[PDB]
Amino acid sequence: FEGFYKLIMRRNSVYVTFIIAGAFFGERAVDYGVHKLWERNNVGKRYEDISVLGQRP
Amino acid sequence: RLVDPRKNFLARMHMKSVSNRLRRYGLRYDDLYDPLYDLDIKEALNRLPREIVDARNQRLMRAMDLSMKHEYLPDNLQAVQTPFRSYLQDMLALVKRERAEREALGALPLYQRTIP
Amino acid sequence: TIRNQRFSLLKQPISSTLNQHLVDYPTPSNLSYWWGFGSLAGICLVIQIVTGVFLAMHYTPHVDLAFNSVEHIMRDVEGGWLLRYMHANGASMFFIVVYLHIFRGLYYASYSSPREFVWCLGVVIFLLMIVTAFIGYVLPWGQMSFWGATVITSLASAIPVVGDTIVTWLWGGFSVDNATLNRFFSLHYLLPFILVGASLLHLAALHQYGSNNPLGVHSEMDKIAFYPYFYVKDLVGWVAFAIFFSIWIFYAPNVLGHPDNYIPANPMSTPPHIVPEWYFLPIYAILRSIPDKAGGVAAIALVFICLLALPFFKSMYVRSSSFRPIYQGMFWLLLADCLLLGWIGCQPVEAPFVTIGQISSLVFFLFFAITPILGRVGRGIPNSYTD
Amino acid sequence: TIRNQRFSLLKQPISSTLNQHLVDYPTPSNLSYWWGFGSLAGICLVIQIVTGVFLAMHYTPHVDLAFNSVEHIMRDVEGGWLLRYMHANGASMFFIVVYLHIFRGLYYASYSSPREFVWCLGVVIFLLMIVTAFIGYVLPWGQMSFWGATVITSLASAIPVVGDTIVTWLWGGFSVDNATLNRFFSLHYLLPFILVGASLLHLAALHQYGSNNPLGVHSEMDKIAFYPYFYVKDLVGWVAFAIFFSIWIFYAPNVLGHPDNYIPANPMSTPPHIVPEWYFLPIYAILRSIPDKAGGVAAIALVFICLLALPFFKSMYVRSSSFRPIYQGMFWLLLADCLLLGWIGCQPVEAPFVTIGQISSLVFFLFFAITPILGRVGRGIPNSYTD
Amino acid sequence: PVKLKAVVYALSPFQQKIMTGLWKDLPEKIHHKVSENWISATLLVTPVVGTYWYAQYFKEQEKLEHRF
Amino acid sequence: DRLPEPYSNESAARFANGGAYPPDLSLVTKARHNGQNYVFALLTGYRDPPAGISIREGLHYNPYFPGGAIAMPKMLNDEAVEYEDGTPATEAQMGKDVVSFLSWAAEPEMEERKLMGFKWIFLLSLALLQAAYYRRLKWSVLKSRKLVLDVVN
Amino acid sequence: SWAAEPEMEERKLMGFKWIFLLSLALLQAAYYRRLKWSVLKSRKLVLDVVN
Amino acid sequence: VPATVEAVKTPNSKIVYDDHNHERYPPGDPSKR
Amino acid sequence: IDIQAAAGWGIAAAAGAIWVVQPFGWIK
Amino acid sequence: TIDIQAAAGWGIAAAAGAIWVVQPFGWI
Amino acid sequence: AFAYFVLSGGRFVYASVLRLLVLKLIVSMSASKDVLALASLEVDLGSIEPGTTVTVKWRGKPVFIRRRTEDDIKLANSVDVGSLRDPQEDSVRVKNPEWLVVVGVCTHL
Ligand SMILES: COC1=C(OC)C(=O)C(C/C=C(\C)CC/C=C(/C)CC/C=C(\C)CC/C=C(\C)CC/C=C(\C)CC/C=C(\C)CCC=C(C)C)=C(C)C1=O
Ligand code: HEM
Ligand code: HEM
Ligand code: HEM
Ligand code: HEM
Ligand code: HEM
Ligand SMILES: COC1=C(OC)C(=O)C(C/C=C(\C)CC/C=C(/C)CC/C=C(\C)CC/C=C(\C)CCC=C(C)C)=C(C)C1=O
Ligand SMILES: COC1=C(OC)C(=O)C(C/C=C(\C)CC/C=C(/C)CC/C=C(\C)CC/C=C(\C)CCC=C(C)C)=C(C)C1=O
Ligand SMILES: COC1=C(OC)C(=O)C(C/C=C(\C)CC/C=C(\C)CC/C=C(\C)CC/C=C(/C)CCC=C(C)C)=C(C)C1=O
Ligand code: FES
């Protein structure tokens, strides 16, 4: 808690790492959340939802 | 002339609108005449007494501060404004008269604009 | 101050020029958000160049391969669709930002003294933007690319003596063909660099006297440094622009264009609806209004002559439309006229659009004809409106 | 004085920058003709850009059309043989002038303080020239072009972990193919404009302190204006260069080249002799003298590292070789060594050229290792040679 | 340099609220925007809208006249 | 390998179709205004011409086609195709399905493009809120300032 | 030989013409440089130092 | 006496800032850094 | 102030490399 | 009255240069 | 006077060199020899039904052929020559009163 907190506002090197980590985790969480809502809104329309998927003849 | 407010009512509306716009910022009409626009205004301004030029500069700083803040002058301050009280037109006209007299007699100008 | 020791690193010779021109340059404190479109235009130029250099790594300027290589970018190149849509929609965004940039100057009389050279350099820049975007639109080699090039390269034929000679030399042959496409690609790579250099001269010319302000008055009493105040102000516009640009790139990537460019070029058939990009429509409408080929080309040239002659017209010493109610009304009529001209350009050449375009073109030219006499009459205002 | 009126137009703001940086710039009066190769290199860059832009109007960057488009330039477009020979031989003239320019800086120690940044910017320019000329040589898509691009992109494989992935990323696939040729064309149009900017910064860095002189001494007591004295001296060099250039263009257009590039690229069979352009041969020689993959690439990087570290060595306070007999003698041995390395690169890899190339590479690196030692020992010259 | 006589008091950016001023005196802001610009908005919208409707009216009458 | 071509060249296509060339359908939904809707309406819009309109021999009437005379015959008839999933192959079902296939063929990147749009417009809106706060925080010292001058009017 | 270099005859005529013309320009270039510099190269400089 | 002269000669601890754009935090509050 | 800063900036550089290049799977 | 002669002299030069750059002897 | 005479001699070469280099770039953009070698051919054609228009190809110039009915010929002969922007008669533009053969390229642009 206080250990990381005092390092972030005191050293710019730590703060820069905090920005990089936030960009990494923040973008991944948004990408995951957007995909979950995309899957929910498109039930049954996916490529793997095809009933005859695997029997061409 | 059609620009006479007393004779033409359209000019009366034009003068009223300009006065109202100027009064909101505490600006005189002669404060809109900038010395960078031409060298005659700069010469006329340089000939004016210091107390007039200092007051012009303070009205301009007040107006630029109001414009930056998205504000107008308070109505109490707006009541004491004199948007059309002149301090430059007479001196500007004299400077233009002197410039034309120099040109008529074939003399070099006292000042020229820098080629940008 | 004797500079024996080294002070702040931004004042060293390594970065003194950048400090005085980008970081500490004094700027009027009352600048509005309408003054942030010059920096946006520079960013749009950077986007166009960066995406264009990477698109040229996959594009083939041959009539037999141009259309297919663009489709190869959209389908096969990893991330190709994004580069193509950021470049196609980027040209439209560039023109939107610049059109707003120009009309900001008209509203505030930014063209007036002592910044006449800034306006004149901008007009040359606008010409470079028009030429650059047009020849780029021929590169996909679609139906509108081919027939768009057939018209503009024929404009030289308005010259009586050497008009046909220039048309053939411009084509590289007797018709629009691979010679025209190959030479248009080389010019489309070179002109953006010339446009970068013209922008640097444009910024340098403005920095000689500084920026104009919404009040249009002397601004030396209240000037602040560009950084950080107008850096963060411009950053707000940059992020808001990115959202607008993203809406087109990801959700409406083809509405700003025409579907006919998705048909491969056919020199035999002709589309029933041959129109330029939306940002060339107002110029196109003025061309179509005049019922004479020679007169139409002269009208297009007269548009740029009127723009170039605007700063040098003897005028009143008041700049801002905030204190010029009559000129303020003229400006809003001109803006509506420019929108009307663009919409007419998309309309077919038939009644009633023919008459409307002629009236619209007449009103556009009236703005530049009425502006000088407003100044001459307006010069007597302080004498008339006494205390 | 009070600048109330307008004096000479050169001192007006429209041309004051050009006047101070070109017409009236203070220049040492004793500059020899060895100081005229900077303007020659600038003129060569302009010639390459102008001829290249017009050649790009006829060239097709496609493996099925690149070779034939160059032959179509030579045979079909009027004066196209002149544009192609001017461009092909212009790259050789550019390197001849820049090589003489670098050696003037070595002889007169123009890299020394206070001109370290000028030398460092020159090394960056030299790297840009090498990359620009190399990727241009791939464009004709001959046998020399294909096998030339195969190994330079393969140089990245010297990196152990990620070396293979960089090679495939540079190729755009798994072999030198149309993807490689198309991206090489885009970069070949862009890098010449980056070279223009780098040369302008190079020029700006030099103007901070002024040019060095053949005596290597303080020159502030005998400076003269660049115009017209060093303009008319540069004009003599320009005409003399034109005669030199015209001889190569009109009478020996293919002597500075290899006939193998007139064979269309064949990915199946390598030529028995495979060499770069002559101006890349000294780098070729150092690469082939190391009997290791990674060692060869490391030595190439060490060449540019040594060129970058030269101005920062603790050196004596005497610049010109005309007062440094030991340094002057080493310079002439280095010049002979660089000539030998270029000749060695043209030779096949076999005895005795392997031993000769190894020794020549050692001598080249010994120059940059001994020069700092000369400075430290030479520091005590004034205290030992007493009147 | 311009000679200036002035007294300026400033407060630290970290001692004041940053965003709540956006929605302060909103009725005054809307009234100022409408009352000062209604002529300007009229001069821009009316010619565009009026011309657009006239063209559609012209097209409708022309289309109906050519029918049988 | 690409999808096979039905004809050797354009001239062979025109000769086998009465002089009209069946256009390539890779980008047809993008190459026409309202492409998805227009193709469906054109496919399912073959009907008798209005009174007073005669169609020359070899052409068919279709109001959606410009001019009304199309050289393509009604090809989407009931049971023209056997579906492996068993859905009834009606005229509208086959018309809807082929336009869906044509839409994907013209825009195979739409799903990736739409997913990128939602994520980055949301992220840029968050940055816009921070950008406004950053601007207002820096400018607060200037906007709240009290300026005292001697001038009145 | 002609098929490989069909422009040779035109190329050689151009070379003789322009190398000859540029040689005249080089002779004029030397006169121009030595005319502008003569005022500097023949000047007499009187200074105060000896050693 | 001019206002600027009066302000210079009379320091005022009860300073009032313009509050149209920003409303201040109560004096004696910790910084929002 | 020198060793700690060097360690901190090296950590940020390593974090940036893992963030720009994602070597997930190469960690074997 | 020498500005007029200057204009006429420069007009001859402009005409002479025009016939020199473009040589329309086969067109006249 | 002698110096100006000598300097003008080299100025002759400089102007010629500048003119040559500028012209060489300009003419390089003109039509190439392979383009000019494809500017003259001949094509034969047949017949079409009345009231129709067939477009043929020559060298980037579509050719409009229209079989005009007798009613079309009367409509094309009942117009004032003076009102025409380009004064021309129907007969001087046609050989067969039924077959109109024109190049289908607008003279405007
Ligand atoms: C229906 O029909 C129409 C369209 O179709 C759909 C349109 O889309 C448009 C819109 C188009 C425009 C508004 C653009 C028109 C404006 C301009 C300026 C034309 C743009 C200009 C060009 C295309 C010309 C390209 C330029 C060149 C070839 C430059 C040539 C010169 C060169 C390369 C250099 C010359 C060389 C020398 C002097 C030699 C020495 C040089 C050195 C550098 C050393 C219109 C109006 C239209 O009615
Ligand atoms: C690529 C195109 C352009 C770029 C990059 C550009 C860039 C800029 C920049 C950065 C500024 C200063 C900041 C600003 O006022 O926004 C500026 C000011 C200005 N520009 Fe542009 N500009 C472009 C096009 C134009 C055009 C086409 C015109 C006019 C036809 C023009 C006229 C002006 C004027 C008059 C100003 C000064 C306005 C003032 O100070 O109030 N510019 N430009
Ligand atoms: C040096 C920088 C530039 C390069 C290398 C470049 C290159 C290209 C290339 C290769 C294409 C064809 C690929 C495609 O069709 O998308 C293209 C298209 C285009 N470029 Fe550029 N370009 C550059 C700058 C610009 C600029 C500054 C503009 C705007 C003025 C512009 C406007 C266009 C347009 C409108 C198209 C056609 C887009 C379309 O409809 O497909 N480009 N450019
Ligand atoms: C933007 C400017 C430039 C453009 C557009 C350009 C364009 C081209 C083009 C299209 C070719 C292929 C045609 C041919 O092979 O002759 C080419 C070849 C070449 N360019 Fe450039 N170039 C430029 C600048 C340069 C520069 C600065 C250099 C030297 C550093 C250079 C060196 C070469 C070389 C060596 C070749 C191959 C010559 C050969 O055919 O043997 N180019 N260039
Ligand atoms: C694009 C190619 C280059 C151009 C156009 C260029 C241009 C110039 C010019 C105009 C000067 C001043 C006049 C002169 O001394 O000749 C100069 C000086 C110099 N250049 Fe370069 N240069 C180029 C490449 C290089 C390279 C590759 C180096 C070596 C790394 C270099 C090192 C220097 C040095 C040391 C000076 C100072 C010379 C002195 O004053 O004694 N330059 N350059
Ligand atoms: C479900 C099957 C088909 C679909 C979805 C389809 C789609 C299309 C489309 C979108 C067009 C262009 C519409 C336009 O120009 O606006 C077209 C035109 C045409 N199609 Fe097809 N097509 C199909 C099958 C066929 C078949 C089987 C034939 C011939 C036996 C054919 C012959 C033609 C012809 C000749 C044209 C040109 C019509 C004209 O130019 O008037 N099509 N088709
Ligand atoms: C007070 O005055 C100022 C303004 O007015 C109020 C401004 O608006 C801006 C902000 C806007 C700028 C700088 C516009 C960008 C500059 C130009 C010339 C427009 C086009 C620029 C391009 C395309 C950049 C490309 C140039 C490159 C890459 C040069 C190479 C250099 C490097 C890679 C380092 C600044 C800094 C400013 O002070
Ligand atoms: C027989 O063998 C050999 C050849 O053959 C005949 C040669 O000719 C050469 C000549 C090559 C030399 C001297 C070195 C060339 C040096 C470099 C750095 C070229 C490498 C650059 C390439 C391939 C293009 C640069 C790519 C970039 C910048 C990527 C673009 C990316 C972005 C913009 C993001 C050598 C040594 C050789 O031994
Ligand atoms: C006393 O100082 C001077 C010198 O000694 C330091 C010189 O040696 C020279 C002569 C040599 C010069 C200027 C070499 C510079 C060459 C460069 C930067 C590369 C080629 C130059 C180009 C492409 C011009 C780019 C510049 C601009 C402004 C863009 C516009 C130009 C064109 C469109 C052509 C000059 C004029 C000079 O004064
Ligand atoms: S090209 Fe036919 S009217 Fe313009």
Residue D212's nearest CA partner among D330, D37, D35, D23 is D35
Residue C253's nearest CA partner among F30, F37, D11 is F30
Quick one: I21 exposed, middle or buried, by C-beta within 10 A (0-12, 13-18, 19+)? exposed
**Which residue has the least CA distance to atom 3 on ligand 10?**
K108
Q: Give the position, in ligand 9's atom list, of the atom nearest the Cα of D21.
A: 38
Beta bridge partners of K67: K99
Residue K21 touches partner J, C-beta closer than 8 Å? no
Q: Give the position, in ligand 6's atom list, of the atom nearest the Cα of F99.
A: 5
CB of D46 closer than 6 angstroms to any ligand 9 atom: yes
Residue D237's nearest CA partner among D345, D75, D93, D64 is D93
**Helices D66-75/D80-107 angle, 10° precision:** 100
User: Residue C148's CB: how many other CB atoms inside 10 A?
Assistant: 22
Q: What residues of chain A, 1 to 20, have a C-beta less than 8 Å from chain F? A: none
* Cβ D210 vs Cβ G26: under 8 Å: no
Resolution of the coordinates in A? 2.7
User: Residue D362's CB: how many other CB atoms inside 10 A?
Assistant: 12
| Location of structure tokens 């700003």 | C256
Dihedral angle over CA of C261, C265, C270, C273, nearest 10: 10
Residue C336's nearest CA partner among C311, C356, C315 is C356
Q: How many CA atoms lie within 13 A of D147 on its CB side?
A: 19
What are the E-state strand segments in E1-68? 7-9
User: In this structure, is the dihedral angle defined by the CA atoms of residues C341, C342, C345 and C347, taken in order, positive or negative?
Assistant: negative
Distance separating alpha carbons of residues D118 and D126, to the nearest angstrom: 12
Host H or E run for residue E30: helix E26-65
> Does C114 sit behind a cis peptide bond, omega within 30 degrees of 0 on the bond before it?
yes
User: Residue B1's CB: how many other CB atoms inside 10 A?
Assistant: 10
Structure tokens given for D121: 């910017």
* Cβ E43 vs Cβ C336: under 8 Å: yes
Length of chain J equals: 28
Beta bridge partners of K54: K65
Give me the amino acid identity at C330.
M
Distance separating alpha carbons of residues F101 and F94, to the nearest angstrom: 10
3-state helix/strand/coil string of chain D: CCCCCCCCHHHCCCCHHHHHHHHCCEEECCCCHHHCHHHHHHHHHHHHHHHHHHHCCCCCCCCCCHHHHHHHHHHCCCCHHHHHHHHHHHHHHHHHHHHHHHHHHHHCCCCCCCCHHHHHHHHHHHHHHHHHHHHHHHCCCEHHHHHHHHHHHHHHHHCCCCHHHHHHHHHCCCCCCHHHHHHHHHHHHHHHHHHHHHHHHHHHHHHCCCCCCCCCCCCCCCEEEHHHHHHHHHHHHHHHHHHHHHHHHHCCCCCCCCHHHHCECCCCCCCCCCCCCHHHHHHHHHHHHCCCHHHHHHHHHHHHHHHHHHHHCCCCCCCCHHHCHHHHHHHHHHHHHHHHHHHHHCCCCCCCHHHHHHHHHHHHHHHHHHHHHHHHHHCCHHHHCCC
Distance separating alpha carbons of residues D282 and D295, to the nearest angstrom: 16
Residue C323's nearest CA partner among F114, B28, H23 is B28
Beta bridge partners of C27: C224
3-state helix, strand, coil in chain A (%, to 5): 70, 0, 30
Sequence-separated (6 or more) residues with CB below 8 Å from residue D29: D222, D223, D224, D229, G40
Quick one: D48 exposed, middle or buried, by C-beta within 10 A (0-12, 13-18, 19+)? buried
* Cβ B58 vs Cβ B50: under 8 Å: no
Distance separating alpha carbons of residues C154 and C163, to the nearest angstrom: 9
Of F84, F85, F115, the CB nearest to A34: F115
Asked if K30 lies within 8 A of C268 by C-beta distance, the reply is no
Of K26, K32, K60, the CB nearest to C175: K60
Distance separating alpha carbons of residues C133 and C349, to the nearest angstrom: 24
Q: What are phi and psi of K42, to 5 degrees?
A: -140, 145
Distance separating alpha carbons of residues D257 and D89, to the nearest angstrom: 9
CB of C119 closer than 6 angstroms to any ligand 2 atom: yes
C87 annotated as ligand-binding: yes
**Helices C293-309/C353-378 angle, 10° precision:** 30
Residue D377 C-alpha to ligand 5 middle, in angstroms? 29
Host H or E run for residue A6: helix A2-8
Distance separating alpha carbons of residues F144 and C292, to the nearest angstrom: 61
Distance separating alpha carbons of residues C343 and E53, to the nearest angstrom: 13
Structure tokens given for F86: 């068993």
Beta bridge partners of E60: none
Chain centroid to CA K19: 30
Beta bridge partners of F69: F61
**Alpha helix locations (H) across chain C?**
16-18, 37-55, 66-76, 80-108, 116-138, 143-152, 163-171, 178-206, 229-251, 281-289, 293-309, 325-346, 353-378, 381-384
* Cβ C233 vs Cβ F1: under 8 Å: no
* Cβ C97 vs Cβ C117: under 8 Å: no
Residue B71 touches partner H, C-beta closer than 8 Å? yes
Kindly list the residues of chain B whose beta carbon comes within 8 Å of any beta carbon in chain E.
54, 57-58, 61
Quick one: D234 exposed, middle or buried, by C-beta within 10 A (0-12, 13-18, 19+)? buried
- Give whole-number Cα distances, D8 to B114, C208, D226, in Å: 11, 19, 18
SS3 E7: strand
Buried b / exposed e along C357-370 (16+ C-beta atoms within 10 A): bbebbebbeebbee
Q: What residues of chain K, 59 to 98, have a C-beta less than 8 Å from chain C? A: 59-62
Asked if H22 lies within 8 A of E21 by C-beta distance, the reply is yes
F chain contacts of residue E12, beta-carbon cutoff 8 Å: 141
Structure tokens given for C43: 């960013």
CB of D42 closer than 6 angstroms to any ligand 9 atom: yes
Residue F116's nearest CA partner among C93, C85, C96, C97 is C85
User: Residue K99's CB: how many other CB atoms inside 10 A?
Assistant: 14
CB of D19 closer than 6 angstroms to any ligand 9 atom: no
Instruction: Indicate the DSSP class of residue H24.
Output: B
**Which residue has the least CA distance to atom 13 on ligand 7?**
C39
Beta bridge partners of K53: K66
* Ligand showing the shortest atom-to-Cα distance for residue F22: 6
**Mutation test of the interface with chain E: which of H8, H15, H23, H29, choosing the one with the most E Cβ atoms within 10 A?**
H23
Sequence-separated (6 or more) residues with CB below 8 Å from residue D352: none
Quick one: B34 exposed, middle or buried, by C-beta within 10 A (0-12, 13-18, 19+)? buried
* Cβ D199 vs Cβ D94: under 8 Å: no
Instruction: Indicate the DSSP class of residue C22.
Output: I
Distance separating alpha carbons of residues D183 and D188, to the nearest angstrom: 9
Number of folded domains that form chain D: 1
* Cβ D70 vs Cβ D138: under 8 Å: no
Structure tokens given for C289: 């209004």
Chains touching J (at least 3 CB pairs under 8 A) are K
Buried b / exposed e along E32-48 (16+ C-beta atoms within 10 A): eeeeeeeebeebbeebe
What is the radius of gyration, based on Cα positions, of chain J? 12
Residue E18 touches partner H, C-beta closer than 8 Å? yes
CA distance E17 to chain C (A): 18
* Cβ C249 vs Cβ C82: under 8 Å: yes
SS3 C142: strand
Residue D22's nearest CA partner among D200, D285, D262 is D200
Number of folded domains that form chain B: 1
Sequence-separated (6 or more) residues with CB below 8 Å from residue B30: B56, B86, B87, B88, B89, C382
SS3 C287: helix
Distance separating alpha carbons of residues D347 and D117, to the nearest angstrom: 37
Residue F70 C-alpha to ligand 6 middle, in angstroms? 8
Residue D130's nearest CA partner among D330, D303, D319, D267 is D303
CB of F16 closer than 6 angstroms to any ligand 6 atom: no
SS3 K36: helix
Structure tokens given for F48: 């008798």
Quick one: I28 exposed, middle or buried, by C-beta within 10 A (0-12, 13-18, 19+)? exposed
Give me the amino acid identity at G7.
E
Sequence-separated (6 or more) residues with CB below 8 Å from residue A29: none
Q: What are phi and psi of D27, to 5 degrees?
A: -130, 140
Chain centroid to CA H17: 5
Q: Give the position, in ligand 3's atom list, of the atom nearest the Cα of C145.
A: 40
Residue K11 touches partner J, C-beta closer than 8 Å? no
SS3 K44: coil
Sequence-separated (6 or more) residues with CB below 8 Å from residue H27: none
* Cβ G35 vs Cβ K3: under 8 Å: yes
D203 Rama class: left (phi>0) / alpha (psi -120 to 50) / beta: alpha
Residue D244's nearest CA partner among D35, D50, D94, D346 is D94
Residue B89's nearest CA partner among B60, B36, B52, B51 is B52
Q: What residues of chain C, 13 to 72, have a C-beta less than 8 Å from chain K? A: none
- Give whole-number Cα distances, K77 to C141, K67, K71, K73, K91, in Å: 42, 16, 10, 6, 9
DSSP chain F: -PPPPSSSSHHHHHHTTTT------SSTTTSSTTHHHHHHHHHT---PPPTT----TT-EE-TTSTTSEESS-----TTSS--TT-----HHHHHHHHHHHHHHHH-TTHHHHHHHHHHHHHHHHHHHHHHHHHHHHHHHHHHT-EEE-S---
Distance separating alpha carbons of residues K54 and H15, to the nearest angstrom: 89
Instruction: Indicate the DSSP class of residue B116.
Output: -
- Give whole-number Cα distances, C58 to D140, D182, F110, in Å: 17, 6, 21
Length of chain B equals: 116
Instruction: Indicate the DSSP class of residue G44.
Output: -
User: Residue D57's CB: how many other CB atoms inside 10 A?
Assistant: 24
What is the radius of gyration, based on Cα positions, of chain B? 17
Distance separating alpha carbons of residues B40 and C250, to the nearest angstrom: 56
Domain extent, residue C325, equals 1-387
SS3 I10: helix
**Which residue has the least CA distance to atom 1 on ligand 10?**
K109
* Cβ C104 vs Cβ C35: under 8 Å: yes
Asked if F144 lies within 8 A of H3 by C-beta distance, the reply is no
Buried b / exposed e along D273-288 (16+ C-beta atoms within 10 A): eebbbbbbbbbbbbbb
Length of chain D equals: 387
* Cβ B46 vs Cβ B77: under 8 Å: no
CA distance H25 to chain F (A): 12
Chain centroid to CA C367: 20
Length of chain E equals: 68
User: In this structure, is the dihedral angle defined by the CA atoms of residues C144, C147, C149 and C153, taken in order, positive or negative?
Assistant: negative
Beta bridge partners of D27: D224
Residue G14 touches partner K, C-beta closer than 8 Å? no
Counting other chains too, the contacts that B32-35 makes at CB distance below 8 Å and 24 or more residues apart are B32/C215, B32/C216, B32/C217, B32/C317, B32/C318, B32/C319, B32/C320, B32/C323, B33/B88, B33/B92, B33/C317, B33/C318, B34/C216, B34/C217, B34/C218, B34/C317, B34/C319, B35/C218
Asked if H21 lies within 8 A of F143 by C-beta distance, the reply is yes
Sequence-separated (6 or more) residues with CB below 8 Å from residue F68: F49, F53, F55, F61, F62
E chain contacts of residue C320, beta-carbon cutoff 8 Å: none
3-state helix/strand/coil string of C288-329: HHCCCHHHHHHHHHHHHHHHHHCCCCCCCCCCCHHHCHHHHH
Distance separating alpha carbons of residues C24 and C224, to the nearest angstrom: 8
Active site residues of D: 207, 211, 233-234, 277
Structure tokens given for E59: 């097209």
Q: What are phi and psi of C322, to 5 degrees?
A: -65, -20
Host H or E run for residue K53: strand K53-56
Distance separating alpha carbons of residues D270 and D151, to the nearest angstrom: 12
Experimental approach was cryo-EM
Beta bridge partners of K102: K64
**Mutation test of the interface with chain D: which of C57, C199, C200, choosing the one with the most D Cβ atoms within 10 A?**
C57
Instruction: Indicate the DSSP class of residue C264.
Output: B
